[PDB]
């Protein structure tokens, strides 16, 4: 069984992935995804989640007192706390495999310039904390990153959801003047495998030379 | 003014586009985002969008005929056709800057094992086509990739407006749970604050992303 708790100021962002879980998996207790509005843990009538950065400059920083109360309530000693951030370690398929056998993931979704660093520092003294980037681009908030992480992790949990793969084809054999490569129809399955390997090599050279 | 069309067999999965920054840019009229159900272009009783691969292998491939009809209707020669795929060129901040100047993005979201390669090949005979990966992991579908791409592009479009990681940030109170904000940040010395932030950035980068500074990855 896996529990995923997401904490966010935009809880509606995660509702479609919640509803996408198959009922059989939920009923079997294989997976439970819960979403929490961070504003439940604000202190003031204005429900403030952010404040000006120490040292100056633009933007805002999310408040440690609010996040600290949220994580105190949601996390336990078994929690793996995931903090999406463009300044994080890379989230990769290896990470997804590792996290797919965790009992409890908590995803803390940030906004503005991120979460006051003492939140992660303090949490790390009582649980495991993982600051991760999903790619070399900047989002406005952690919610889209949470969606990517949830999808990549949960498709590796049974019954829930080096070289590049080459092109794929289906019927019809000829379409808009373009034929499916005839080798694929040849019934020479060793040759087909070699053809696919060369297609993957060429595609990796063209698109991802870093991988070779 | 930008137009983004998203084509998917799961249109409800794109509802998050109405939240947060993409939602506000939608409300401000700077961008119009339309989501289309690919099954609208099917003709059979069962609305079939997939068929088994040629050459063997597991899974299913999205049929070219249905996609070709959809893109015929939605795209023009001016369109930038975005095809998310883990086998694509990397989508990066540079890509986001480039696409932020485009008049029309169409995002073709795959499912199953992906879309028959001739769909992209055919589209490229009349428009620009970009097959892109959003990262070194595997999603079940292109819908989450579309949301990432839309968010990263929309925050750059004029009307809403480096090679290093940003260091840590702090806000009030100055002491919390016995944990202090670094004193330099409280000191008011702008030059010492700038130098500390630059050092924190470079130290975080070599620890977390040594590749960005030209060092081996672990
Ligand atoms: N590449 C990425 N990977 C994971 N999370 C990201 C991300 N890019 C942005 N985020 C999320 O979005 C939040 C704000 S981005 C932080 C800086 C600010 N957006 C700016 O540059 O002006 C982050 O704290 C993180 O939660
Ligand atoms: N890293 C990534 N970047 C962009 N899109 C991705 C992606 N991973 C998955 N997708 C999307 O999800 C769809 C199905 S994944 C495609 C099959 C894959 N070879 C597999 O291992 O099963 C793709 O066609 C693409 O639209």
What does this structure look like?
Two copies of one chain form a homodimer. In chain A, α3 runs parallel beside α5 and α4 crosses α6. Chain A has seven helices and nine strands. In chain A, 31% of the residues lie in helices and 21% in strands. The first copy, chain A, is elongated, with a radius of gyration of 22 Å. In chain A, a hairpin with a 2-residue loop joins β8 and β9. By secondary structure, chain A is an alpha/beta fold. In chain A, the strands form three sheets. A five-stranded parallel sheet of chain A has the order 2-1-6-5-7, with helices on one face. Chain A has a two-stranded antiparallel ribbon with strand order 3-4. Chain A has a single domain, classed as SPOUT methyltransferase, trefoil knot domain (Alpha/beta knot). Chain A starts with a strand and ends in a 5-residue tail after the last helix. At the A-B interface, α1, β3, β4, α3 and β5 of A face β3, β4, α2, β5 and α3 of B. Bound molecules: S-adenosyl-L-homocysteine (SAH) (2 copies). One S-adenosyl-L-homocysteine (SAH) binds next to β5 of chain A.
**Ligands (ions, cofactors included):** S-adenosyl-L-homocysteine
Strand proportion of chain A, as a percent range, falls in 15-25%
Largest interface: A-B, 83 and 80 residues
Q: Helix/strand/pairing class of chain A, anyone? A: alpha/beta
Which second-level CATH architecture of chain A applies? 3-Layer(aba) Sandwich
Spatial order of strands in the largest sheet of chain A: 2-1-6-5-7
Our measurement of the CA-to-CA distance between the termini of chain A, rounded to an integer number of angstroms, reads 38 Å
Multimeric state: homodimer
PDB class: transferase
Keywords: Methyltransferase, Mycobacterium Abscessus, S-Adenosyl-L-homocysteine, transferase
Assembly: dimeric
Entry title: mycobacterium abscessus TRNA methyltransferase in complex with S-adenosyl-L-homocysteine
């Amino acid at each position: 069984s896996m529990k995923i708790d997401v904490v966010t100021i935009f809880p509606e962002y995660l509702q479609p992935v919640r509803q996408s879980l198959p009922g059989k998996a939920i009923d079997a207790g294989l997976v439970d995804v819960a979403v929490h509005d961070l504003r439940r843990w604000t202190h003031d009538v204005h429900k403030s989640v952010d404040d000006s950065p120490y040292g100056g400059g633009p933007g805002m920083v999310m408040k440690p007192t609010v996040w600290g109360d949220a994580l105190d309530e949601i996390c336990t000693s078994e929690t793996l706390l995931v903090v999406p951030t463009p300044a994080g370690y890379p989230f990769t398929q290896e990470t997804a495999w590792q996290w797919s056998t965790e009992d409890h993931l908590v995803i803390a979704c940030g906004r503005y310039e991120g979460i006051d660093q003492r939140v992660a520092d303090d949490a790390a003294t009582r649980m495991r904390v993982r600051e991760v980037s999903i790619g070399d681009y900047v989002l406005n908030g952690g919610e889209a990153a949470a969606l990517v992480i949830i999808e990549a992790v949960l498709r590796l949990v049974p019954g829930v959801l080096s070289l590049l793969e080459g092109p794929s084809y289906t019927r019809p054999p000829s379409w808009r003047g373009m034929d499916v490569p005839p080798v694929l129809l040849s019934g020479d399955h060793a040759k087909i495998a070699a053809w696919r390997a060369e297609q993957s090599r060429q595609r990796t050279i063209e698109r991802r030379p870093d991988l070779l």
